[PDB]
Design a protein around this ligand. Sequence first.
Ligand code: VVE
Ligand code: MG
Ligand code: MG
Lengths: 548, 409
Amino acid sequence: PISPIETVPVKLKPGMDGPKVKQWPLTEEKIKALVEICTEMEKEGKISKIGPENPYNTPVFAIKKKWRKLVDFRELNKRTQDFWEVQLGIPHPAGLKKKKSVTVLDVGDAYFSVPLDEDFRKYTAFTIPSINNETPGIRYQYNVLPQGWKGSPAIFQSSMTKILEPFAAQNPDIVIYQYMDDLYVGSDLEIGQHRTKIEELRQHLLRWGLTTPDKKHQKEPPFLWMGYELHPDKWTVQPIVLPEKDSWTVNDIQKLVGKLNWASQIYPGIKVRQLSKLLRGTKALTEVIPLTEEAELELAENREILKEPVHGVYYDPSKDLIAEIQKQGQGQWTYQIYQEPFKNLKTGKYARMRGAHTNDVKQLTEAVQKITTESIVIWGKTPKFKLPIQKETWETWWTEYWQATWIPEWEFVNTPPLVKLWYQLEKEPIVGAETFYVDGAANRETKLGKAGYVTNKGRQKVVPLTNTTNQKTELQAIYLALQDSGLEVNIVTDSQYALGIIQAQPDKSESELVNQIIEQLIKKEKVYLAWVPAHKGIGGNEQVDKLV
Amino acid sequence: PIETVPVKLKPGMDGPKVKQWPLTEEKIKALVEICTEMEKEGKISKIGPENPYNTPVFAIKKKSTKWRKLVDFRELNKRTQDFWEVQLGIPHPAGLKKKKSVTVLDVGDAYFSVPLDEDFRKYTAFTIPSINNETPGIRYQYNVLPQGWKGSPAIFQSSMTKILEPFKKQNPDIVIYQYMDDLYVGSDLEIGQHRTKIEELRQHLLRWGLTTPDYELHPDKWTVQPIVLPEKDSWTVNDIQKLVGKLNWASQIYPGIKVRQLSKLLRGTKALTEVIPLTEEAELELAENREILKEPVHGVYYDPSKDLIAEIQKQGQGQWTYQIYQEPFKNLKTGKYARMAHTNDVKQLTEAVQKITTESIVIWGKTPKFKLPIQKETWETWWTEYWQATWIPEWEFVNTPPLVKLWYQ
Ligand SMILES: CCC(=O)n1c(=O)n(CCOc2cc(Cl)ccc2Oc2cc(Cl)cc(C#N)c2)c2ccccc21
Ligand SMILES: [Mg+2]
Ligand SMILES: [Mg+2]
């Protein structure tokens, strides 16, 4: 009930004042049921009648499905100061510490059990109607944390935090985690002393006004907590029911991608690239979307993965942390975090391309990032990494990459598929290889263009192109010089675009053109690519810029 | 240690509300050790949830098995600028760059005497985080001028300038600048006696109660480092190209440039690897533009109304090159940096950034905003590992590659 806990001071936002929303009259049956609760809440001290002096008011309504009381504090919430944000995030089960036994305690009337600042009680004034009748309403105020007030979750949690500080000192062999109105007590005691401690705590709480359930009413494993089944030696997501439907709306594909994502923390192999591409349009939620062929497949493969059930294990500090990454092919990667070789802590995916052109070395790097951030959040350390890449593949790439990166301590693993640099441009030009001077141009308005070349061997060509762009041709030009060339070739281009794209050495791209340039680049055994300023008559581009 | 200077935010600016980065259990532990002590010595106090404000908080290892706390008051600083720039602004001696030697002294333990405005403390709130969100962070606010806030030295400036008055009297050839928690002391002494004049000061300071740390920059070397056209024995078409290109790019910085004679000296569709030779009319533009690269640019003046912008570019071989500017192609300062199986790319970047930032303070008394060539999240993870400075520049992350590279080497 109301407690001897100290109150937190509360202010209204600066240069505001208290709400004054008048109340719609309700059924004379409802108005009955409101007073039955009011007085039994008054007896218990939670609220106190007041004289009309108080000018403030907040709407009250009533409902049931034992009637219940709801208040529309929305108007009050808008004018009350802001507080320290509550825990936005929830603890991931994979990082919960393994403990001998685990007790779950829910507190009851949590908010009503905590006192509210006195000088801020006036603003909570409500009134109960008198079935019209021009009969004066009942003016009441709260003396405790009201339900659905902006301040309640934070002040309650302060209060709970402080109320626990004594006990926690006198019993540091036990661990209490806090979440909203619950308490999760874990110990490495013997089942008889833990039950003792719990029942001890429950009494500490009750002396501060916080009610808690019996040994007879304590929730018992497994625990349905925040979309998870928490077993005493294993955790998993709750049951997942992907629907079969004939037509698919946007709202549906979102809820699907969600669920699939949810599943990814413990169910390996889950892919969502092709499914999420469908949503790219990010248009209306009720718009129907055709399923692509690849999407239908991905949902199929996903369905198989969830066909059986799989479980995650809890954390052991005295055991090392390990991370393994496996490629999947469509710019899709997956990882497992484990201390022991068959008992995974959790799993997930990295698939973001971060651009329209990537290479696997880069992507794998980005994947390790993702894992490091999460590792640090979850277990407060970073994991030893087991990666399908050769120490020589990586050093070569990063030494030659324009950005800077940090490769954490990592050991090779042979499990194919393996990560590789499929091609490498030459650093210096090639003596005795034909030099092509590619250029390509397109008229924006006509939406037509042409790529061609010219060589030191006097060879010239121009292919014609319909429905393209300057950029699209700048690459086709290169695509050509690769086609019409031996296994060693010098290409010379005036477009920094096309150069940029290729110097990055992508091995995979959204653009088919680039995927084909990638193909050709793989065959060639020496390619050198070189830039020169366009419209600068460098000698040779002049000639090729002329045939355009 | 009695009168609290009043502090006002610029009107219609609420305090900072910045998310706390998650930290390694190692680093948390240090912050708990450190704060438990700070709280006993009364420098900070626990706070309730009627405080919504927050400022991030890191743990670094100073120079040193001793963990130190670093607080990121970039936000608060922006929202108090009225107070630490105008009201009690510390003016910048535009000559410290002239001196042949400059030493940097951490004086920030000065501030922990001075109490902080009673009404302003709510805005210093920080959070020690927990792991896996087991429990909500530990919440403190400062009771005393906190290191890292720009108000802190601005307030102390009186007590500092008094304490400094004897020493400035004795040797008035020395310059002394205060940027936050650092004294920059420059002198034209030979090194041997500069380092003793720094001992003097140290012990002058120390006996008026200012402890100091128990790093010499010679700005007599700083200069816009000019573009270098590698002349070699041989030449090719390719190299004529690389050469032409460099020079064409430079035309944006030194319009006074030309290469037609260069651009005609290969007018034939020729193989790249043709050892072409030197011509008279062409060669006239190599040397003629080769010395223009020795001449400085025209009309490049530091606007103090504008932010400084630093760009760094990885150049390989543990090499990094940087340019500071405010309007494109108008480069105020430019430099290069290098490490000495001990170093990694990040460590290097982190060092470079630190170095460019000090240069910046010496010269202009303001830090630059960095265009860092790294991935946001990688930086946001490992930058505290080699961070030694008491302050923190603004930064952003260029995800667009350079291509120029050598062009700025
Ligand atoms: C040998 C293992 C054993 O008996 N159990 C075990 O290790 N876990 C995981 C650890 O869980 C907790 C650890 C601590 Cl310090 C505190 C509470 C814990 O439980 C929570 C945590 C949370 Cl955030 C929500 C809820 C709900 N609702 C429960 C177990 C979990 C359940 C049952 C037994 C074990
Ligand atoms: Mg719950
Ligand atoms: Mg790819």
